[PDB]
Nucleic acid binder design. Structure first.
Length: 50
DNA sequence: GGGTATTCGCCGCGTACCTCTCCTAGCCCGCAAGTATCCTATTCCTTGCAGCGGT
């Protein structure tokens, strides 16, 4: 069981770290982006990767 | 030249997460530490020159 709201940030590319050791967040993988595009949902996707 | 066959080389092969370990090799030069050696004294003996009483 794990959670993250606002923690650290990677260095080269500003994205949340990964893994439970560091306080990282989950990964909104490619297939999930496809899935969100399949709905009419556009605002949520745009915010979720911007 | 030309239509064809055969070979060569490049491109590709699922998502998300958890645990662990390990991450250049070799030379070189200053440098700390530890040591064997060399000069430093003391005691005995036998010389060589300058003062010195004595007449």
């Amino acid at each position: 069981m794990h959670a993250r709201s606002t923690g650290s940030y990677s260095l080269v590319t500003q994205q949340p770290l990964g893994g439970k050791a560091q306080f990282g967040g989950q990964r909104f993988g490619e297939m999930e982006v496809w899935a969100l595009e399949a709905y009419g949902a556009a605002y949520t996707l745009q915010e979720m990767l911007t």
